[PDB]
Amino acid sequence: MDRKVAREFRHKVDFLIENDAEKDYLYDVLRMYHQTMDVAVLVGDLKLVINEPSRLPLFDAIRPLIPLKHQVEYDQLTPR
């Protein structure tokens, strides 16, 4: 029901991240959130690979994935 949104943002990432490394770092970040289940670790690493206007779209992009609860805590941790 909301799979297109993932591939849509993910697709945007590839467009804004031609390199493979940036993608490698992002992969580790996503795997961390799934394993650790902590949005605090995601915010930190996220900025590292999303500290640029061009990379910013990833911060807001991945968010939608995060559950409502983690969304509130995630949004709080983020500059907004």
By CB under 8 A, name the binding residues for other proteins.
1-3, 5-7, 9-10, 14, 23, 27, 30-31, 33-34, 62, 64-66
Nearest-angstrom CA–CA distance, 40 and 73:
8
Q: How far is the CB of 16 from other proteins (least distance, A)?
A: 14
Minimum distance from residue 14 beta carbon to other proteins (Å): 8
Cα separations in angstroms, 49 against 8, 21, 69? 19, 10, 24
What is the distance between the alpha carbons of residues 75 and 71, in angstroms, rounded to a whole number?
6
Query: Smallest distance, Å, CB 56 to other proteins?
Result: 17
